[PDB]
Each structure stands twice: as structure tokens, then as C-alpha cells.
Design a protein around this ligand. Structure first.
Ligand SMILES: [Cu+2]
Ligand SMILES: [Cu+2]
Lengths: 620, 620
């Protein structure tokens, strides 16, 4: 059995059993995160010890715990007590989100604010959001959620269309107290409905779209064995699923003739922040850490055939844990399919009379998650020529506010009185590199322009320059689209036939990084987002750019701390962390449901192969 | 019928007849360029007047002519004689290409060069390339082609694998003289074959690929009317074809409710330069202006169903003129189809219980051309949401040289002894803007970062700024990926329901622009490629960024001269010229045949619609 197989329902149940038996899962205990641990560095280690990491929360206010259990041995290997005011709070629980609206509904200050606006409390939905760390000392060590109101006129109504601005509440979800209710002033509540399924808004539906039928009369070209091991057009990998990170790809390799060569040991989106740029006290604290605080895999959708994934699909239904350790399956939560990708190679040669054309293909592995108003699709692609690519698709309903009379520098208008605060969606890809094995290195490649003169008398010459990042103190890099900056990960001990170290080149989209002032909380807490590329020496406990406990953590966790070690990355076991995102100034066409916008990156072989790896592709 | 209809074989024959009748097309005359002109500006068009412009060459040596004839009226509107040493030579003729090898085969300096390398002249192919303007005074006024040698060992052999470096010959193609033969020294001719159809190189072909069948059961969703007028999912446009530019899109409009709203009057790739960056005298003059000097449309391939275009395809077979004015059809030279494009919009709402998912699709209009070793695909895409996108696909065989023994800063090694000089592939998209009509304006939009302090105490705020480009002198712009710079074209007189000027935002890929020294021949001849965006006031004689005659023409024409007029572009009839390209340092993976690499740009609505234009898309 493979060490990278997906967690079984019974394994979750076994973890539950081991925890209750050791008296660590009592009636006041809640599981805020549960995930299988990856195998440690080894190869001839056939003694498989299946271990799970669990973050246990306590509803009574008692210190939480980080527990490591061996589902194979049936034992608790570790169980450490956490000082959350030092190391941050655990991920927020679904039941904690539910308590915010309920608690506010009986609070005198909240009911008063709602009375002044003439809104029926039973019609007021509250978005229970992360708190972050600002200037409220009484929150340290406490689990707080901040709430924003939205009106829902009827059950099928889209509450996002009616934000109740000038109002924000802070709630302690363990002691169940409303710690603060801020009412900065009354703002009209946007009246227009944003119901995209309402025939009064859509108008007569189109009857012009003819069907596009994509089928595979002989089945797919990939094989799925061991439940999650994929073999497709020379590629090999294992598809994992974590409740925090979502789809994770393991042991990405390419079979170059005789040998199966490694490229990436582990690929995942390790964090994803959505910071808001509205300086209003009602929203200036708003920063979603979708992966770290909310756990994206937890909210993964059950994809529908023909609607979400068209063609010959192969699904994976991963299993996660609930707050009590019971297994929960996300049916059809991962899509796997190959799709046509146009022309791969083409040449019509005059001299030889040979006309050659080959088509391209990509293997797609994806999932879609929903974080409140927003829905995100995470797509990983493998191409015939050895290219690896990631694409994030953002959709959903934009987060709203009121549009200030007299306009705004930080909010855009979507409808009459309806605003949409400026924000960004910034992702972090954790790429545990293994180019032909673990002895890797990273170089920054810049285009070099040359000046006209001796050796370049016609002033036509241009070159390139590569700088090797040797220590971690020099591995925090910035993009430079102007000079065509890319980063090559190579194995200095593995050469191609021309005796140059094999490599892969990372092509970024060069979008803007974190815009927030460098001294702000979010800049401290999401420091990874301020730079485009980070390279660290691998360490088993360094899994997230924002750290293990993001919720209400002070700042400087994850990447800045890891880098501070200043380890040797020149020809070592390294990890590449690429920051990429969308800066969003919502437009009128993003209402009342926004069309997909995308971001991503890709890695292309750079002298990895001896010649083109697609010469054996047939005609057809 | 429609004034934007494709030129017919009848019209071409008639232009030939009109020129003949006028004594402009005798036996020594050759058609170097023939294309139908676009209707004059305004809506007061007094009936059908189809005019064609022609560049007439003279093989005996007499000055060429530029003629405009009215095919409708049977007249010659104008006919001017050209002083080519001043205004530039005419595009290269197909017959002048084959002349080069023929002539060199009997020149003693060439035979001696080949003999010193032990090469059989009957096996030496010569790549006949444009000459440019350099230090050779005897070329002024003359039509020169420079030749580079490649050995073809057998008939089905790929000569590109066997470059003969250290040698180049300049040939006058009118007087049929070999003016110079430069031999800088003997270089070993690379021995490995790059025969990608040879079993010895490919090995056994993959048997792993299963069929992907894309069919459309009820036919496509677009209609083709009047030969080239396309109507698809609210979009409306005319697909034109010019022998210089290739596919051209006219009158791009979107049917918003009851009104057909114009977006782009005319879109085309007006120029594409491929400058080389090897300072070797043998290649330091190499710069292909594929559109301007070679004319990409004449070299358009006849696309095969299945391998070139998968799905339900509708082809256009445009007609061009041959060198004698006789019409020539490029069968299936333009392919049109719609393809599924994933997810358009998606939201699973907790509060309303409504789960909504909609699929995207795009209309594709494309053609592929072959310029010697390289093959380029030009793709235009229209999406359901109002997005317009262009994509260039570069493939074919890379241009080779010998790889210098002790390495090279300007050439990369692909095989033993085989090199590939550094080069770029830069495009210029000319977008004659008509955002809701001709009164347009362009704003440069940058992200604005804010400092923490009063009014932004938590330091999370960020904004954006827009700068109207008012006069052409302040409309030559460069990219800034770091501040998320984009350009919005709006109509200051047409406002959406929120009282904001409707618009479209241009998103560039921010790749490096021209790398050559600013004082070089190519920087002056390809000045357009030195900046990312240019905006000019519309003029019927300002068609290409490099001018009407690029072949052996110096700087003095094109964008830098148009811009000098410093005309008003603030709410006028304007034209946007966007520069975008690939900077290419060939990889071993690019040999023997190059896998497709792409570049492009796109435009998205920016307050153009009153809300999302895709609310009427049916359930999927
Ligand atoms: Cu957004
Ligand atoms: Cu190239």
C-alpha cells in the first residue's frame, strides 16, 4: 500500500478512537484540524507508520492541544499544550460561525443599531469573519470573530446586495459574549436585489447556445491506481487532499525513457489571503486567510457532472473529519480529466516537403471551494511537453458595502448605493522541489541588454544573466517583468547531454504583490505576500508561509521566521514559495455574480531533457 | 453587398484589368501587394465604392508605383511613382526568394567558400532573408536579399540542423548580381540530423493517447452571413483578410439588449518583428518584419480538419492576388469555431440555499502562417462576458548557427556544435477603438499604495489613479507590472447607469519590449517595439507602425512620425497600438522542432455594461 494514499474513513474513526481512549476527546473537546502526516525523508523505509496531526480545541476555555497519533500502532505519539496568546489560535470551527448571529440577536446594542435602520432582526444575516490582531489587548488569548450585517428580504434572497454599513460587532465565541458593537453612523441599505436566478433581472434566458459535446469513446489516457496514483503521458504523481490546503500533489515525476525522473516532491497552495483596502473602521480589519483560518478543503464543493466538469471525468471523494472526529466524505470533490490543448508543434518545410502538425493535451486535477461570498477553483495542469501549471479561478458574489455619497478612493460602485471595497486575492504555492532528486539550487535569470560598441557594433546583441541564491538571507525575491525575470531550479549534480545541470524555469504572471503599508498588521501576518518568490531549506515542520496557527497570531510567523535561520540553499533539499494574486477593483460587470477571473504560474523544462520529450507523440 | 465583405476572385481579376487598361500592368510589372481598402469614415456613405491599393514592382529596374483603383467605377484613383531609396522598397516577392540559391550556385566566391568546407553545392540550401539598412552604400535604391547556408543531406532532410556558419552572401535580386560573399572563417557544420519524423530519432510512437471527440450535435451557435459576417452570443463582427496583416476583424460589437454597441472598429496585427541578438557579422543584420517585408497573409497555411482545427469548424478561403494580378485562393486558410471555456460564474450560497453554476465559451477565429523555419498562429477570441483576446502561437524549427567552442553569451547550445541565436518575436496590435462609437479617450490606470497615518491608521488602504492621455505627445507609454498598470479606453460621452463613462480595460502580459540598443538600425526601423502602448488620432493613411514600405527602409515613417503631429486624442477617433512579444533564449527542448510558446493581450469591459451581461446564460 502506498504511503501517499488518501486517508480512509476508518482511519479518521481510528484517530477518534485513539483520542477518546486517551481521554483527549471529551465532551468539551473539538477537532479544529485533522490531517494525515507526510512520510519523513527516507526511501528504503518500508516500515510504514501512518500518522495524523490533530489540533484539539476546548469549549471550556482550557488550553488547546497539538496531538500526533499513529493510526498504525494505535498510540498517541505526542500531545502538546498550546499557549495561543503566543503561538496563535486554532482554526475557526463551523459551529463558532453559527453562534455569532444568534448572540447578536439578543444583544441590546445590536438590536438598537438595527432599530435605528428599521431592519427586522430576523432578516439580518451576519457574516462571521476572522478578527486578526489589532489594538484590542483584551482579545489576546481569546477567540474572537467580527461580524458584518447583510439583509435577506426573503429566504431565496441574496443578502450580499444589502450590506448594513456603519455597523460592526466583535464576539468572543468561547465565553459567548458580544464584546463590542460599533455604530459609526447610519448608511442607506442598498435596495436593489442581486438575485441572479430571478427572471426579472435575467430577462428571457438565451436560446442561442448549441451544445458542445466532449467525449472519450475509449476512456481516458490516464490510469488511477492505489486510489490516488496517476499515470498519464509519461507523468506520474499522487493526488492528496488535506482539509487545510485542499488538493496536494505528491511525487510529480516524468518517465524519460528508462528512468522515472523526479521534478516536484510536493506541490500545494499553502496559504491564500484576501486583504481589504477600505480604511473604514467597519472593514479595516478585514483579511481572510482562507487556507489558514478557514481551511479551504473543508468547504470543497461536490462537483456535478456536466456542470462543473465536462467530458470524461474521474472523481476522487476524499474524507475529512468533523468537529468530533467522525469521518465526512466530500463526494465528487476532486475532478480528474485530460483535455485537448490545441497545437503542440507545427512546421511546413519548403525544402523537405514535410508538413508536420501535432496536438497538445493537458491533465487537469481540480477542486472548487466556497468561503462565504467567494468561490475559488484550484486547477493543476500537466502538459505533454513537461510543463506544469497552476491556475486559480475566482468567482462568487463580491463582498459589499455602501457606496459613500461623494464617492470613494477605496471602494467602487456596483449599483445604486451599493459599494464594493478594493481588495486582493493573493496565493502562495509551496513547491517542495526535487529536480532529478533533492540536490537542488535556484538562480534568478534576468535579460541583459548590451550597449553598442566593440563586439556589438550594430547594437543588436542581448544576453541573459543567472544569479545563484546561496543562503536564505538572499532568497527573498521580487519580480521584474521589464527585464524578463524568471527563476530556474536546477540540480547541479545532474547534467544533460550538453553537460549543463538539468533545470525547470518558473514563469510568474508578475501581478502586484501585497499593497498594504509595510507596518500594518496584515503585512506582518502575511509577509509572504509582500514578495514574489522565497526559497527555504526544507524542514519537516515548515509547512505554511503563515505558520501553523494563523488565527489571531500577532505577526512574523511562517516565512520570515524560516528565512531568519539563513540556511544553505545552494545544492540542498529546498522549497520554493511563489506568491501570486489578483488586485481587485470590482467593476459593474462583477455584479451581481462575478464572472471568473484567473491568476497562476507555470514551470517549463529548462534543459531538463536531451531534446524535445514530445517527438514520440503520434499523428492522429 | 456588405462593404466589409472579403475580396472576391472577380474583383481581383478586375483590378488587374483596370491596371492593364491604364498601362500600369505590362509584362515587366509585378504585384508586390494588393488589398481592398476599408470604407471611408462616417455614416454618410454614398453607396458601394470598393477600392483596392496596389504596390507595383518593375523587374527591368524602373521605379515602382503605388496605385489605388476603384474596382466599382473602373478607374485609377491615383498612381504615384516611388523613390524607394527614400520611402522604402516594396515587400519581397516570392519569385525573388528562389533567385538567391540559383545565383550563388555559380558565383566563384561562394563555390570557393563551400569548397573550403567540403560541401556539395547541390546540397546547400540558402535561406533568402530581408536585408535591412546597414553600412553598405551600394544597396540604397536596390532590392537586396542576404543568404545564409544550410546543408540538406538528402531530400527529406531538415537542413536547419546543419547550418554553415562563417558565411553569408548579399544578392541584388533585380540585376541578378551577387554583390558580396563574406567568409569570416570555417566552422564545423553540425552533424546530427534533426529529423522529427524519423523513427531513429522519435523511437516507437506513444500508443497511450486515447481519442478526445469534440462534436457539436446541433451545429455551431454562430452564424456566417454575407460570406464573413459573424454573429455569436450577442457579438457581431466581420472577418476580413489582408495579404499583409492576415486576419483582420472589423466592426466588433455587442448586442446589449436592444442596442448593438460598437467596441472595436478594426483590429489587426499591423506588424511583427523578429530581431536577432547574436553580434556575429554573419547574423547581426537578421530582423524579420514578417508582416511588413514578407506579408504573413500570403504565406497562410491551408488548415487540415482534425489536426489543425478540432471540433465543428467553419472555414473561410480568402482570395489574394499572385504576382501577375491573377486571383489565388488560400483554401481553408481561416478557421472559425466556438469552444467550451470552463466555468463562467459559480456560487453556492449558505443563506439562500441556492447553488448556481454557469459554463463559459469562446468564439475562435484563427489562421497559421509559415515564414521559412518559423510558423505562427494568430488567434482572436470573443468570450461570453464581453472579453476580447488575442493570442500568437510561435512554433516551427528554430533558426540555427554553429555553437562557438568556448561558449557564447548570445547563442545557446541545442546539440553538439549546434547553436541557436537569442532573438525576440514582437507584435503590434492596431486597435481602431470605437467604444460605444468613435468619441474615445485613453486613461493609464496605476495602483496607488497608501501610507499608514491619519485616515488610514491601520495601514491597509490602497487606491488607484487614472491619467487621461490628452495629446499624442504624451501617449507613448511603457508597462509597469509592479503597479498593475493597465489602459482603459472609454467614451466620455456615453455613460452607464451609474453615470460613469463606459469603458474597456487593456491587460498586457508585460513581457520585455525591444532589447536592441536605441541607436541601432532595428531600434529605428522597429521603433514601435520599444514602447508598450501608443495612441494616435485616426487618419486613413496611418495603417502600420512601421509605415507602408518596410523593406530596406530606414526610420522616418511609422509611429514616431504619426505621433509628432501631437493631435487631440481626448474624446476623439483614436487608435491604440499595443506592442507585445516573446524574448527567446532557445532550450534543448526546443530542438528538433519547437513546442508552441504563446503571447498576447486581452480587453475586458470596465463599466461598459450596467451589470453582468451573462445573466441570461442558461442552466449548465
Ligand atoms: Cu475579488
Ligand atoms: Cu523564438
Amino acid at each position: 500500500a502506498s504511503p501517499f494514499r488518501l486517508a480512509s474513513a476508518g482511519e479518521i474513526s481510528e484517530v477518534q478512537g485513539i483520542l477518546r481512549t486517551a481521554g483527549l476527546l471529551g465532551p468539551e473537546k473539538r477537532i479544529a484540524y485533522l490531517g494525515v502526516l507526510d512520510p519523513a525523508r527516507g526511501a528504503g523505509s518500508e516500515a510504514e507508520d501512518r500518522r495524523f496531526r490533530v489540533f484539539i480545541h476546548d469549549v471550556s476555555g482550557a488550553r488547546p492541544q497539538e496531538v500526533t497519533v499513529s493510526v498504525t500502532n494505535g498510540t498517541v505519539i505526542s500531545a502538546v499544550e498550546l499557549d495561543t496568546a503566543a503561538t496563535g489560535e486554532l482554526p475557526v470551527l463551523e459551529e463558532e460561525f453559527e453562534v455569532v448571529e444568534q448572540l447578536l440577536a439578543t444583544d441590546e446594542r445590536w438590536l438598537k443599531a438595527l432599530a435605528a435602520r428599521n431592519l427586522d432582526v430576523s432578516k439580518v444575516r451576519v457574516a462571521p469573519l476572522s478578527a486578526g490582531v489589532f489594538e484590542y489587548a483584551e482579545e489576546r488569548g481569546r477567540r474572537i470573530l467580527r461580524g458584518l450585517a447583510f439583509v435577506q428580504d426573503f429566504p431565496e434572497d441574496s443578502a450580499w446586495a444589502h450590506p448594513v454599513d456603519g455597523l460592526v460587532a466583535y464576539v468572543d465565541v468561547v465565553s459567548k459574549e458580544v464584546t463590542r458593537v460599533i455604530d459609526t453612523g447610519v448608511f442607506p441599505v442598498p435596495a436593489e436585489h442581486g438575485n441572479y436566478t430571478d427572471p426579472e433581472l435575467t430577462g428571457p434566458l438565451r436560446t442561442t447556445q448549441k451544445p458542445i459535446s466532449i467525449t472519450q469513446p475509449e476512456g481516458p489516457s490516464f490510469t488511477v491506481t492505489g486510489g490516488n496514483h496517476i499515470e498519464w503521458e509519461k507523468w506520474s504523481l499522487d493526488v492528496g487532499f488535506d482539509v487545510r490546503e485542499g488538493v496536494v500533489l505528491h511525487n510529480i515525476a516524468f518517465r524519460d525513457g528508462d528512468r522515472l525522473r523526479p521534478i516536484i516532491n510536493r506541490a500545494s497552495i499553502a496559504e491564500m489571503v484576501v486583504p481589504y483596502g477600505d480604511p473604514s473602521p467597519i472593514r479595516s480589519w478585514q483579511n481572510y486567510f482562507d487556507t489558514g483560518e478557514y481551511l479551504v478543503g473543508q468547504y470543497a464543493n461536490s462537483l456535478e457532472l456536466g456542470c462543473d466538469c465536462l467530458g470524461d471525468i474521474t472523481y476522487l471523494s476524499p474524507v475529512i473529519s468533523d468537529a468530533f472526529g467522525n469521518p465526512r466524505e466530500i463526494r465528487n470533490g476532486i475532478c480528474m480529466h485530460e483535455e485537448d490543448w490545441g497545437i503542440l508543434a507545427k512546421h511546413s518545410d519548403l525544402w523537405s516537403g514535410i508538413n508536420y502538425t501535432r496536438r497538445n493535451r493537458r491533465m487537469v486535477i481540480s477542486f472548487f471551494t466556497t468561503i462565504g461570498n467567494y468561490d475559488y477553483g484550484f486547477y493543476w495542469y500537466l502538459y505533454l511537453d513537461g510543463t506544469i501549471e497552476f491556475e486559480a479561478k475566482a468567482t462568487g458574489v463580491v463582498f459589499t458595502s455602501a457606496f459613500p455619497e461623494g464617492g470613494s478612493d477605496n471602494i467602487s460602485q456596483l449599483a445604486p448605493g451599493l459599494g464594493a471595497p478594493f481588495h486582493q486575492h493573493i496565493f502562495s504555492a509551496r513547491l517542495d522541489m526535487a529536480i532529478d532528486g533533492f540536490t537542488n539550487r535556484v538562480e534568478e535569470e534576468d535579460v541583459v541588454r548590451q550597449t553598442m560598441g566593440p563586439g556589438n557594433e550594430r547594437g543588436n546583441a542581448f544576453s541573459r544573466k543567472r544569479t545563484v541564491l546561496t543562503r536564505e538571507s538572499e532568497a527573498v525575491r521580487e519580480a521584474d517583468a521589464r527585464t524578463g525575470r524568471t527563476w530556474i531550479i536546477s540540480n547541479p549534480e545532474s547534467k544533460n547531454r550538453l553537460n549543463e545541470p538539468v533545470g525547470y524555469k518558473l514563469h510568474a504572471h508578475n501581478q502586484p504583490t501585497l499593497l498594504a503599508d509595510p507596518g500594518s498588521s496584515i503585512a506582518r501576518r502575511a509577509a509572504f505576500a509582500t514578495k514574489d518568490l522565497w526559497v527555504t531549506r526544507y524542514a519537516d515542520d515548515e509547512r505554511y508561509p503563515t505558520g501553523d496557527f494563523v488565527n489571531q497570531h500577532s505577526g512574523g510567523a511562517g516565512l520570515p521566521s524560516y528565512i531568519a535561520q539563513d540556511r544553505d540553499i545552494d545544492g540542498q533539499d529546498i522549497v520554493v514559495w511563489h506568491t501570486f494574486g489578483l488586485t481587485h477593483f470590482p467593476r459593474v460587470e462583477d455584479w451581481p455574480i462575478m464572472p471568473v477571473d484567473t491568476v497562476g504560474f507555470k514551470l517549463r523544462p529548462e534543459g531538463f531533457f536531451d531534446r524535445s520529450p514530445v517527438l514520440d507523440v503520434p499523428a492522429n
